[PDB]
Amino acid sequence: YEVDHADVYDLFYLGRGKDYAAEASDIADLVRSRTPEASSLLDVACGTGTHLEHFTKEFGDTAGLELSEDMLTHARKRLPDATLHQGDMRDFRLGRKFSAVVSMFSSVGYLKTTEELGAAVASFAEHLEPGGVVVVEPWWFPETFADGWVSADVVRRDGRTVARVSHSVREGNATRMEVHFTVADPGKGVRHFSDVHLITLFHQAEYEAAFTAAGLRVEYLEGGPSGRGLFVGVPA
Amino acid sequence: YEVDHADVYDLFYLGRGKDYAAEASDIADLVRSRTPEASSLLDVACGTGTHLEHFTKEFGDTAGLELSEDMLTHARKRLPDATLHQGDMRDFRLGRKFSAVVSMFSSVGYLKTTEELGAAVASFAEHLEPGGVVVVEPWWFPETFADGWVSADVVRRDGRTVARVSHSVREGNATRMEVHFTVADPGKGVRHFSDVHLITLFHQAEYEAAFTAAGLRVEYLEGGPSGRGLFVGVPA
């Protein structure tokens, strides 16, 4: 019995209560707060495009960047008319600029070293219009990481039930999170799958340094959509 | 990081709220309602011995029978002084009698035909003292089986998390249940495993014929510890 992973991740976070719409909206205001005339936005590592959908309604002129083809395929299925690009946040070149460049849900954490973070932040800066703003939702900091953390949840949405458990342990300067998904569709079957994610624990200062090197004045905001806060940058 | 499967089931059921003490307690009084001076009890397919430990304070002279050596190693670890037997409820011969012979938690559902169910029941009968009573907690009947059923729960006990998902579908005259367990211990690791169970859907009438053939006058009691009811039989 087969199941589509990304579709499974999508149903889970929706059922979990993650609210992409509300998230998208708060970010748009955040964006407007620094760039009132904001008129275009780029979602780096947009995944399946849930925030992109809403950002598209907010600013109209939007685009998405994703390293994963599979993420891309799902994004396209959700947004057949969206402008999407395959590429690495590390060094992409889109040949255009945007009022805002944002990266949500800790994607930059998948960057392996400060040199990569810096390069990815520089790239963000490079697609930024004058008076633009960069918003990055980071992964946890070495100082705020909760080692050995276990998450276990059950969601049931649209007739499907999904159980998910993750265990997180620090390894080096990264979080090694192993996730187990259990999926069941009544009268159809039950299926299990797991993923292992390595998310870098950059110190906040490392994050800020990446913004400074890219010529961006940056500020960290506590809280954020997931409790990891948010980094906001603008041309220095 | 490895996990002891039966200890997993155990912790699971405790966490879920299955009250083996209360159940044994209820069965103990059910027995007495039929055999007031009941003084010995055999627990057939005792599993890891949870009910047996309680029946032991209930009647003192007790014994357990299990076909599974694994189940027996855990019952023994739990009760170093319990009298335990390895063997088949279809045809074991203990060379002794008990005031009560009980089989809990749908164990007889693992028998595949009415012929086996009859041989098992005759065996219980053959181990019964005069004025004794047999109590069988059956599996669901074809008439009350809920096909496509999905069960999904998360329990947390002794700092260990266990997420369990089962999906049940009818197959011929049995339920095929595939059970998925996901277990984690913070800072220890996370593990997943799955089992598949084929439990016969015997009609109520079929359970009765078994008792009848065994020389016992039987009564079906609605509800029971698992909502599957209970069969109470005494020498006709």
Ligand SMILES: O=c1ccn([C@@H]2O[C@H](COP(=O)(O)OP(=O)(O)Oc3ccccc3)[C@@H](O)[C@H]2O)c(=O)[nH]1
């Ligand atoms: O104060 C905290 C609380 C949680 N965590 C970490 O947050 C994660 C929560 O596990 P999760 O599976 O519920 O998080 P998630 O659904 O957000 O998974 C991810 C992983 C990477 C990027 C986005 C979502 C774990 O790594 C845990 O160590 C911390 O580091 N600090």
Ligand SMILES: O=c1ccn([C@@H]2O[C@H](COP(=O)(O)OP(=O)(O)Oc3ccccc3)[C@@H](O)[C@H]2O)c(=O)[nH]1
């Ligand atoms: O009205 C009902 C309600 C439940 N069921 C069946 O009860 C079972 C409940 O799933 P479960 O995983 O919660 O059962 P369990 O934890 O009691 O697992 C077993 C399985 C065999 C023996 C003992 C416990 C499923 O097969 C479901 O079809 C029915 O047939 N009819």
Ligand SMILES: C[S@@+](CC[C@H](N)C(=O)[O-])C[C@H]1O[C@@H](n2cnc3c(N)ncnc32)[C@H](O)[C@@H]1O
């Ligand atoms: C936690 S998901 C976030 C997806 C989306 N932002 C969301 O909110 O759901 C991390 C995403 O980053 C993408 N990703 C990882 N490394 C990347 C890189 N170097 N360049 C671009 N995208 C990357 C992954 O493919 C994945 O879709």
Ligand SMILES: C[S@@+](CC[C@H](N)C(=O)[O-])C[C@H]1O[C@@H](n2cnc3c(N)ncnc32)[C@H](O)[C@@H]1O
């Ligand atoms: C659902 S478990 C319940 C066990 C226990 N009475 C309880 O309440 O936890 C069913 C048990 O039946 C045992 N079993 C299955 N077939 C058997 C047989 N033919 N003879 C004896 N035991 C059997 C299995 O080893 C398993 O431990």
